[PDB]
């Protein structure tokens, strides 16, 4: 049905892996699992074994793994898979795509699954302090097939092909309405409250869905309220390595709509947190390189209570801001909203094979 397969291969062309697809969502009961395939050239049947690894890595640095001073690691989940020769089978669901492939690469392409564990960071990179570009904090997936006789071999990268998959976070709607955040407060000389009060249509949205802000003011002071400032804000606390809070603005409206003294305002507004606009921005959290054109906003992180928050390396959640400027001459009123973003839900409610470089994007 029109399957695309991307594919990678050893720099020695004699190891390649097949995957069907980049990024694996995660489901919060489950993370669909990684099943793949590894073509062997029968020419290295001498060391004569395969190893399929994938690693889960909070880093600091850059993505060419180059410890050039002042590097970071700390692995958060690994799983090893002797792939060749088949060993003590576990379980071999072999997925419809694997028994496809196996059948039309051949005798010597041999699967491999990964089973990732639910509750770990799904991938993020973020780049802190000044804007070099230089190294950057981030989760990443790493799958590594090389051969070598054992598990302890320094194997030579000749042998290894190495992929970065990614694990993207979704998470289903089933609300009853958001609740409404509210300030009252009073404005020497108010005597009685400008009263705000805002909240948002969803709990849940998705990347480049819009977001609508409902902003209900009750002005009982004799102040003019001049503007409105709109806003969604990313957080992003680093919590591995080298704590430290970030905060960047990813979206903004400012209206000159105004509030009349001893008067009640009431409007939507509509606004769409979108990384195009974001593209300079640094201390920023991303679901992957700026490079790549499938990289957006990091997804929000689903925390559980009492769960280890220090092992998720990254900490990222979004907010709304309402802003009333208020002419004294000025004063700020404002409440934050809440609110989830999640990786947009995947669309799958002779032979059909196109092969296709993974290789980045």
């Known amino acids: 049905k029109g399957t695309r397969v991307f594919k990678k291969a050893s720099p020695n062309g004699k190891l390649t892996v097949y995957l069907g697809k980049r990024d694996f969502v995660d489901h919060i009961d489950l993370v669909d699992p990684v099943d793949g395939v590894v073509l062997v050239d029968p020419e290295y049947l001498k060391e004569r074994r395969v190893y399929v690894t994938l690693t889960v890595a909070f880093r600091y640095g850059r993505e060419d793994l180059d410890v050039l001073g002042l590097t970071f690691r700390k692995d958060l989940f690994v799983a090893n898979v002797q792939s ?13 795509l694997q028994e496809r492939l196996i059948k039309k690469l051949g005798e010597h392409a041999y699967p491999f699954t990964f089973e990732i564990p639910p509750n770990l960071p799904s991938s993020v990179t973020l780049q802190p302090g000044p804007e070099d570009t230089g190294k950057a904090l981030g989760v990443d997936y790493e799958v590594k097939a090389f051969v070598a006789e054992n ?57 480049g869905e819009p977001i609508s802000v409902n902003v209900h003011v009750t002005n009982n002071t004799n102040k003019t ?7 969604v804000r990313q957080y992003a606390d680093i919590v591995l390595f080298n704590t430290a809070q970030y905060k960047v603005p990813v979206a903004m409206e400012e209206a000159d709509d105004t509030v009349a003294p ?11 947190p979108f990384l195009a606009n974001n593209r300079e921005k640094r201390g920023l959290a991303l679901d992957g390189k700026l490079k790549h054109e499938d990289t957006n906003l990091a997804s929000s992180t689903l925390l ?15 907010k709304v801001k309402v802003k009333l400027v208020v002419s004294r001459a000025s004063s700020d009123v404002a409440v ?25 994007q």
């Open 84 to 96: 060749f020769p088949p060993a003590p089978e576990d379980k071999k669901p072999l997925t419809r």
């Open 151 to 207: 598990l302890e071999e320094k194997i030579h990268k000749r042998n290894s092909v190495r992929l970065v998959i990614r694990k993207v976070q979704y998470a289903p709607e089933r609300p009853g309405p958001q609740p409404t955040a509210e300030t009252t407060r009073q404005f020497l000389m108010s005597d009685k409250p400008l009263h705000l009060e805002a909240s948002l249509d969803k709990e849940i949205y998705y990347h």
């Open 225 to 231: 309220v001049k503007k409105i400032k709109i806003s």
């Open 262 to 272: 001893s008067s009640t305002f009431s409007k939507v507004y509509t606004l769409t």
């Open 304 to 318: 559980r209570e009492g769960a280890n928050r220090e092992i998720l390396g990254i900490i990222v959640s979004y």
């Open 336 to 360: 934050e909203l809440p609110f989830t973003l999640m990786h947009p839900k995947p669309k799958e409610e002779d032979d059909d094979i196109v092969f296709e470089d993974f290789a980045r």
